[PDB]
Amino acid sequence: NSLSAQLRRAANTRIEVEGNLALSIANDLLLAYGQSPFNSEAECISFSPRFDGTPDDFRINYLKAEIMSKYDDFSLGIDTEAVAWEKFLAAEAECALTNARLYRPDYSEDFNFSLGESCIHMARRKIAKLIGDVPSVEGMLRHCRFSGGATTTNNRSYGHPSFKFALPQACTPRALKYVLALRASTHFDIRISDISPFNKAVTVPKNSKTDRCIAIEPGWNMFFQLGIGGILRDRLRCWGIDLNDQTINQRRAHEGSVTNNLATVDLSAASDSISLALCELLLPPGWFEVLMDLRSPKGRLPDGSVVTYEKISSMGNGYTFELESLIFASLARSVCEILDLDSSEVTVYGDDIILPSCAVPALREVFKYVGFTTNTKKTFSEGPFRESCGKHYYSGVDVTPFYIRHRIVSPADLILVLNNLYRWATIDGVWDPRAHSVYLKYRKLLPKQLQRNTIPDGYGDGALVGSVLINPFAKNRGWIRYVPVITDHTRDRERAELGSYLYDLFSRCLSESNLFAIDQLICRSNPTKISRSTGKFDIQYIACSSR
Amino acid sequence: ESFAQLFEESLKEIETRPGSIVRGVVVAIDKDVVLVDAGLKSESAIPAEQFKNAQGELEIQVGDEVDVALDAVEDGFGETLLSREKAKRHEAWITLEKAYEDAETVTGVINGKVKGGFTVELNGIRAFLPGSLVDVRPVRDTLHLEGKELEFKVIKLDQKRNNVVVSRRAVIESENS
Amino acid sequence: TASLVKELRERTGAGMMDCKKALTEANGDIELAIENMRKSGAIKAAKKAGNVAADGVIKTKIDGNYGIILEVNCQTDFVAKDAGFQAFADKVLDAAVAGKITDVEVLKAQFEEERVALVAKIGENINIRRVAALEGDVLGSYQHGARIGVLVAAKGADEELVKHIAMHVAASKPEFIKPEDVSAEVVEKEYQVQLDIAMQSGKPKEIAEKMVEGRMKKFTGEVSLTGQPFVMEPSKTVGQLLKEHNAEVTGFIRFEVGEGIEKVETDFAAEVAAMSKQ
Amino acid sequence: TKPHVNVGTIGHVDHGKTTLTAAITTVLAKTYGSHVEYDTPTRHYAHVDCPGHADYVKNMITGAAQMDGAILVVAATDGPMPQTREHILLGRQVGVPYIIVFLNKCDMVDDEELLELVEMEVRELLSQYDFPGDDTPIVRGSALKALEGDAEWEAKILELAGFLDSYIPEPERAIDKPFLLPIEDVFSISGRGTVVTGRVERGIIKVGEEVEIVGIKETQKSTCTGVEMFRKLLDEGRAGENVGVLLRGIKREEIERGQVLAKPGTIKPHTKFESEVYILSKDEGGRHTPFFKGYRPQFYFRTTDVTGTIELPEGVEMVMPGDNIKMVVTLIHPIAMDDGLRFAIREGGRTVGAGVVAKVLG
């Protein structure tokens, strides 16, 4: 009764002190490592490191350049999402230049046409060899699904596929013929709200200096796009590309850290960079037709302004990830093939690429020809530092930092930060005596019961990571050991009955095709339950194990 | 398995269904208005049909399939909206249609060697020119120029999937008449 | 005749055709046959000796304040449950206890003439793996399956206490009794290992030294019986339980079948296709 | 479209089990047009060899391979072995209903009467363990002689295959069993009413039938209004199909997940039962800490978890991971169950092991 209620109390106790607690933690941590503190909110984002010297210095300097970069509560500057819109408009104008360039070459500027076109043909032949002339309707269907967040019809709350089946969704005047076929394939009512070429473009937070431009597609469009993207992802395995597993690229980045034979390349504007023309070349008209059908040709901005897309698809599209992966893979494999290098050396996850360094100068010439810009302060073909898929390595050791992206208010946020610091500053559960004092100091900002409550690592951020055997709140019921954690408090919402039912029947329809592996055949998938979060916090007991 | 069948067949039926017109079902009729559901939350309403000729009880019926034309947001423009592909590439494939069937010399430029041959860019479209078909004398072509405009005659194009094999020696070897 | 062969086989348990040929070379004489088979049994075991024995049993028994634990291994799961194998293991065990034999080679060479007959009878290579002894005032012995067993001698407490302690030992695999009793070579091994992990993690001399020096403190307790959390009561450690019942532990020995053997893998389908490739 | 039968080889190591099954595959393929699977003209076979006792005990509990029949390979040159009794014993313990015997290396046998001795001895062995030793098929032959391409010897392999088809019956079809479907979700539709969704495990449900919803709460009955998938509305509920079932008279709030929709009187709710279970090891992803009498895990039956308490058999106290043990489980609330049903053992969503119900209790 009182035991869980004390934690329920302490979770909802608002912890607040003068100044920026994130900046205080950052500065004290920097101080512990003997580095210059941020003396302004500008120095947080403006700091740039140098690649050299002992890895222990570089780790903390890179950390310094990183940790406070994504903090959103900065009173610094008038900085807006408008910069992201400038980057968007610019990226589109440039994609138009590269579109008209790919379509009709003007033979004297730059770009090495000889290499470029040969790469185009080779990549086209390889691609055609992979996916085939026409996408299978069967595969598309079996991968066709409703999921994710807002559509041009439903908002973030109604983004659940149940509400997608309940409420009519929009469609592209091309892709309409699909949603009719579907309608003819079921005795259920398949409705469309309106038929519009436009998709709703907005900006999701990315960094303090800039946001990220995200596209919101119509419902049915997403429904089929996820199908073709699904079969694309299924097809990319033959090229040795697993999009469900991002750890391979990280391991290979670690390889490129030491040997320095393997170079990594990152692409920011890649999502907005991919040309229509580049796709009409690299892809067979069979795939290109369904791609053009399912995609949103036009778009709308909160400014009310409309834009016709030079790009095929940006972020927030079903197949865009799989598509850009496939394309980058084709071009890079072609590059490595021209240079008589192993084609299995190149691995691509989204826009994150790893291929042998000797292939870079030819690759960067190819990419600049096809409309992909090469960012030198992102990609590393030479220096001891390499990064791919969320991991950063320097000379063999992982320098990967952490970020405080939000003003801390509740103790849960402080626990998140403390746990990130734990994971960064520890090796197999042993504290670096430098950061340990900062940890211990800011751990006194937590209520006593929120201090002494500990959980293992990987169990979530609902408590402080440490030795759980010494945890006083650990209760042994049966022979299983349970421990309480902070949990976001939720109150249930009413769900669409026919929507959830339809979602269920459709999830069952195509599910015909999909000692330890066999006993997992007993378990099933969870039913539809809708909840909305509250600003408050709750406490929940979970089962745990030391190892 | 039959789901893919019904879906695909119905899809091909819709593609085969001509015009921007769509399928609908009459929900109800009135004197000045006939309501037909086309599958959207907003049902279409039409005034006209006939007045009295064949018009009456047997003429229109509830549950009968009716063709509803809505072009309002329908895009024949949305394609032509992007001016880069539409004007150039269509007329290009037209010229290529002229090329096949009693072949004509067309202007194209070699770029770089593919595997078995070279790529030639002819207007908007790209094509493949075999390596043995470069010229009469099979001298090493590594020393030959790339990026220069020459004339070739098309052998074969697939017309749906895009593959175009063009011969360089067609104008030269067959020159004499 | 056949009725004689069945008699010989029923008397011995040797293979059918082996008894046939033995009786053929013995001209009908039974005792001559069993003699020849007896002398052929040695090489009969020698040919099978090349096979590795993964499976087996752990037998344990105590005499007063003295006790003996032993591992004897065969190459299959079924032989270990056979009555003859069991009776043999029990025989050598009881002989070891009553004879107070701490030397493996001695009683291994002692039962050899019996073990070759048991091998010739069974058809699999079996041998005495190892044997050890333990002495203390109060010693319990716990047997979890035939696969693993433990012998624990301690002073004070009670039979139930050392029973539960033995179960904890079998479960937690303690290398040492008390964190003070830990070896120096072990400590140096883990020290240099974790130090190498620390230096491969890009850490300076002092930092790594202090971190690992802090780590040994916990490691010693982890590898020690005293520092380990008690299985029956995870809320407390073992030494706290000893202190509660006011007793200490002199020594313990834990045996498990297949330790160090590595059990060479085998694939059925691959073998089948391999024979189908001929 | 052909039935599937799971079989396996058992016997001494050097007696030629491997050579025998190899001969099976080769001859069967030569005649009619980690495990090995082959085909007869009628049914398909999956062959699994057990490296040990507890290996196939574990393999039986996990539900990976449930052996319908097994062939016993015994060399005539040797005859029965001291560990053969343990082989047959394991045969009874695992509960394989049919055993065929193949005598190998009969070519090297001196006299027929000796083969008769071996036969009678083996049949004695089977009779002692309750297998029909007198009525059990035995086939003489040589796998080595079979592989070399000798037709006269291959005929014996085909004899063993014929016995493999004839002596081992076809496993009962799902349709042949009474109707059962697990209930994953419940919906209340306007103008339709309550409908439960799931995949029918066995039997057929037709419109108008009276069905019994049995589970956690007290079992109740309602009639089927209809059956439908996404595409079409269906007349019948045929097993294996993923469907949903319209119910008449029943409220959405009266049905829970974990309950089943079954043919009335066929299935019953139960609490206490005894079962054979296996617990995963640490490297297998299970608990690294052993458990005891007061163990209170979750038991997953076909849909959802049910908390239950266990009691251990006499002679055992501690249960370590990586091993299999029989135990008596008593649930906190009743779940509809039949004997031979498989369940999972979970802690907070993580599977620490699995089990199969042996004997249902009150």
Could you characterize what this model shows?
The complex is a heterotetramer of chains A (547), B (177), C (278) and D (362). By secondary structure, chain B is of the alpha+beta class. Chain B contains four helices and nine strands. Chain C is α+β, with helices and mostly antiparallel strands and 278 residues long. Chain C has eleven helices and six strands. In chain C, the strands form two sheets. In chain C, strands 1-2-3 form a three-stranded antiparallel beta sheet, covered by helices on one side. In chain C, strands 4-5-6 form a three-stranded antiparallel beta sheet, with helices on one face. Chain C starts with a helix and ends with a helix. Chain D starts with a strand and ends with a strand. Chain D is of the alpha+beta class and 362 residues long. Chains in contact: A-B, A-C, A-D, C-D. At the A-B interface, α5, α6, α7, α9 and β2 of A face α1, α3 and β5 of B. Chain A: This is RNA-directed RNA polymerase subunit beta.
Question: What are the main properties of this structure?
Answer:
heterotetramer, A: 547 residues, alpha+beta, three-stranded antiparallel sheet, 20 helices, 16% strand, B: 177 residues, 2 domains, five-stranded antiparallel sheet, four-stranded antiparallel sheet, 9 strands, elongated, Small ribosomal subunit protein bS1 (chain B), elongation factor (chain C)
